[PDB]
Amino acid sequence: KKFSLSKNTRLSVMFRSMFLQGSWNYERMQNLGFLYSIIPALKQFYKPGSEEAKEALKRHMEFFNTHPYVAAPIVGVTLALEEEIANGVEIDEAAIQGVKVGMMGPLAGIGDPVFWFTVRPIVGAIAASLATGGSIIAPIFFFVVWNAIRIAFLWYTQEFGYKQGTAITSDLGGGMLQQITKGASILGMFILGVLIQRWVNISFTGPNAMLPSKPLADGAYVGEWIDKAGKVVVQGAQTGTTGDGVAKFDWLDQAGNGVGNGVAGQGGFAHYVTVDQLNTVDGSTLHNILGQVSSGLGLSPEQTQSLQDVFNSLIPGFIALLLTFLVLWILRKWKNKNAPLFIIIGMFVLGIVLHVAGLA
């Protein structure tokens, strides 16, 4: 039993199966890539020009379309049957084509959702999240992770297919692949929800879409208590609300003493003033301001609310979810071929309209 493929020949076959595409056609899909992958085995088996070489080369000139990554098991099975047919065994010429057709369909049907729609979107999304800051860590991450996964999958699956021969059908089977498909679908749905929430920004701030600003209060925001000729005071214990309807407060200077003893607001001794009108903030006034901002008080006298604030108070990603479901309905009902480009143009026009209207 001569003509035994070595490890180096199998590695070369894998590196050539890296070129499974390139001669991609519409009537005989992805057929030359298989031959280019299995060229070294045929070269080792039969010399060029022979009738055996003619038959071997013509055998693999049939339609063969599969997800490129999950084809290494097919290549390994083909290498095994090529070794068997080069060792004087009876396996019929159509058996290799039959097994190739058999594992062409289901393997691709599993490969497309797992690789193109689950692994690639996740890796690319992580890479883009890293790339938002313009850092080289992101292309490095994408290239290294994706290529490590691809090389490992190709090499180990080709080795498994070559070792197992036609028996790999008894290992793949049904139900086994459906668990992977369902798990990948669960992970993809979760990640797609996360991506829709985090990466669809439709901020509605604008110069319109601003709800009326509420004067707030007289101390609910960051500010000091200015009195007539400067100086910063603090509200003391109430001495008793007057019958008119205004409470009288103690005005303690920022030393512990007491002075003034008037009413709180404009006409009284002191009134609340935000940081804008403050001058010479040096001293303990900065400490008080820092304490106030650490408490959580805003710096604006009027609480300005936008449409984005209302939407966020409802739930962040409200408009993103509405847009997602609208686009989903449009895609499910249109059933066209150029519909995605039309929807993209539509949202570009929608963004133009929103910007010119002052909403977004």
Binding site: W24, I122, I126, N147, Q179, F190, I202, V327, I343, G351
Partner: protein, 247 residues
């Protein structure tokens, strides 16, 4: 532009064109292609920023069973070259103009690759004729020739765009009004909805919608990064599959 930068851009565009059909090393993805083109022509941070912005759109741009995708390769390469020619990288111009141009060039690349993969039928017939003589060299040469033609499909437009004077392209890119640029920037935060929505439409069931909504609800927890949410999704899937397989 420097001459060495020109050769580097040509090789990167050739690699992106090769990968557009190969789909193995992912040199055609915007995160790789735009970053490489920015690296070649000096400023690299802008290239990585554009690649990250365009990768969200390029998600769900896989081709299955003679249904060719919008071809992120030419989009990435041409958009990166166009940005490089126009010396402005404010990240508002990137979203406003470079991304719609990327979408249009993606459609153009889709039609170009459709033409090339139709034209490859004659090359494959010639390879079959060579294999009729029992020669490995002939079939290998024809396969490599078709692969080279597919790479040239994106190498050539890159050279054509590079031949355009910098002054003319800068003037054309600046002439776009400010208001329409800002509107397109606003819509650029929306256009990823279509890309997400096709992937959602491909896999969606009454059983799997709760997971989508759970991921949507847990997203505002910014202390969990994207890899953290990936591991969370994997463990959630594992627990769900275990509890389902118990019965």
């Amino acid at each position: 532009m420097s001459i060495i930068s020109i050769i580097l851009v040509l090789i990167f565009a050739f690699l992106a064109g090769l990968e557009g059909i190969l789909d193995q090393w992912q040199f055609h993805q915007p995160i790789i292609a735009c970053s490489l083109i920015g690296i070649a022509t000096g400023h690299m941070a802008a290239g990585i920023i554009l690649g990250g912005s365009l990768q969200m759109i390029a998600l769900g741009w896989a081709n299955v069973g003679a249904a060719v995708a919008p071809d992120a390769a030419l989009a990435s390469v041409a958009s990166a070259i166009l940005m490089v020619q126009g010396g402005n990288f404010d990240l508002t111009h990137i979203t406003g103009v470079i991304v719609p141009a990327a979408i249009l060039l993606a459609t153009a690349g889709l039609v170009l690759t459709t033409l090339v993969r139709f034209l490859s039928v004659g090359i494959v017939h010639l390879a079959d004729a060579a294999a009729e003589k029992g020669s490995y060299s002939g079939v290998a040469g024809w396969h490599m020739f078709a692969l080279l033609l597919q790479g040239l499909r994106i190498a050539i437009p890159a050279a054509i765009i590079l031949a355009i004077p910098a002054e003319t392209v800068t003037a054309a890119l600046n002439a776009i009004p400010d208001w329409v640029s800002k509107g397109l920037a606003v819509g650029g935060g929306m256009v990823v909805v279509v890309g997400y929505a096709m992937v959602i439409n491909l896999m969606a069931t009454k059983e799997l919608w709760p997971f989508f909504f759970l991921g949507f609800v847990l997203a505002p927890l910014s202390s969990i990064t994207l890899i953290g949410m990936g591991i969370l999704g994997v463990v959630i899937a594992l627990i769900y599959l275990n509890l389902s397989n118990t019965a």
